[PDB]
């Protein structure tokens, strides 16, 4: 049944709770972003109201075929009323259209649900600053000290330099970038740009990207593989057999592949620096796994919480084992003691 950490007390609301059938007492279903663990269960046959961002609404309409009459998109940074309750949607710095949700309960309690987020100091100057938050529903994906990773800007720098060098040395080298959901678009767009190319992709993927309100997007992507020297593939195909297969399909236009797998975390981060990353190579094919994260590092998460000083924290990730739960509750206690709230 629907777990308690997906229910917002004092309202008829649930968040990201689309795979439990009809939730007893739910009058509005919020969707934080268009990733499958979160939208799981939505479909063209859904007949309850869905509240979400404009971009997430484009994707529900065009990709899931949810009927328009049930999609209620809201603008960001704007006080809105939903079934009698004031709410605000904030940018979650996750994938395109991802939001956090502020709920202002009738009784005076204020709740922040983060959705999936990558905490950032810039959040400390949104409408969050303007009042106290009593309860926090927190994306705890990387809530452990071993999870360090570099900034997004450092990772992109590394990829840009790597690709530019390889292709300048060998003009017949193809670059391939793996994808399986929205998010991490900067990886392939930044590379394409330094190489003066468009990104070539399948029709389904091109459609997906046309939902995202990315400016000048028509200048940046295409369905014509032949005209483009950065290709996107399913993440499943980013391996030697899969890439060898694809090279055969390009008809002798290229003789080398450089490929990128944007990973979350990988234990090489406990020792090695970004400057010091190396690929896996077989023949004329090389694969880089790069730690481009759209979730908070441990330190980013800790800083956010210590700034916010909530009265209660409810984890939404890693909640399935007692050992995880217990480990997370200890870190929360340390943070609260260290900061004094
Ligand atoms: Ni996500």
Curated annotation (Swiss-Prot):
Tissues showing expression: Expressed in brain, heart, kidney, liver, pancreas, placenta and skeletal muscle.
Cell compartment(s), UniProt: Nucleus
Result of altering residue 139 to N: Impaired nuclear focus formation, reduced interaction with PIAS and increased sensitivity to cisplatin
Induction pattern: During mitosis. The mRNA encoding this protein contains an internal ribosome entry site (IRES) in its 5'-UTR. This 5'-UTR generally suppresses translation while specifically promoting expression during mitosis, when cap-dependent translation may be impaired.
Disulphide linkage map: none
Record note on quaternary structure: Binds constitutively to TP53BP1. Binds CDC27, which is itself a component of the anaphase promoting complex (APC). Binds PIAS1.
Functional description taken from the UniProt entry: May be required for DNA interstrand cross-link repair. Also required for checkpoint mediated cell cycle arrest in early prophase in response to mitotic spindle poisons. Possesses beta-lactamase activity, catalyzing the hydrolysis of penicillin G and nitrocefin. Exhibits no activity towards other beta-lactam antibiotic classes including cephalosporins (cefotaxime) and carbapenems (imipenem).
The family this protein is said to belong to: Belongs to the DNA repair metallo-beta-lactamase (DRMBL) family.
Protein name: DNA cross-link repair 1A protein
Organism per entry: Homo sapiens (Human)
Name of the gene this protein is made from: DCLRE1A
